[PDB]
């Protein structure tokens, strides 16, 4: 059982940075990817970015070259960079792992972001 702890959001002007950070617990040892997704309001929750455990990462067309996506092992913890936030940004941020079909996790709350401008 693994469960993941979300925090960094919030709202932001425009152009403004946030760093998101997903802290595990439980079974960590064996965590292969972990994503950051997002869901815009009204709309289906999306990923827009990962890592695997060996530190590969890849990201969704529209945060490339803005989001940075990276982990701590020694903290059990991935990390989501944003810069240059947009409003198109704003959503609930979360973070889990697909395993098959269905999540590594439960769903945590997420984080916010809100991005004004």
């Known amino acids: 059982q693994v469960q993941l702890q979300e925090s960094g959001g919030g709202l932001v002007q425009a152009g403004g940075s946030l760093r998101l950070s997903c802290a595990a617990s439980?079974?960590?040892?064996?965590?292969?990817?972990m994503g950051w997704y997002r869901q815009a309001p009204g709309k289906q929750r999306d990923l827009v970015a990962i890592?695997?455990?060996?530190?590969?990462?890849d990201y969704a067309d529209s945060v490339k070259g803005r989001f940075t996506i990276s982990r701590d092992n020694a903290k059990n913890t991935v990390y989501l960079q944003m810069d240059s936030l947009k409003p198109e940004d704003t959503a609930i941020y979360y973070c889990?792992?697909?395993?098959?079909?269905?999540?590594?996790?439960?769903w945590g709350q997420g984080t916010q972001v809100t991005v004004s401008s």
């Open positions: 890592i695997s455990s060996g530190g590969s990462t």
């Open positions: 439980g079974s960590t040892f064996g965590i292969r990817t």
């Open positions: 889990n792992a697909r395993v098959g079909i269905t999540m590594l996790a439960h």
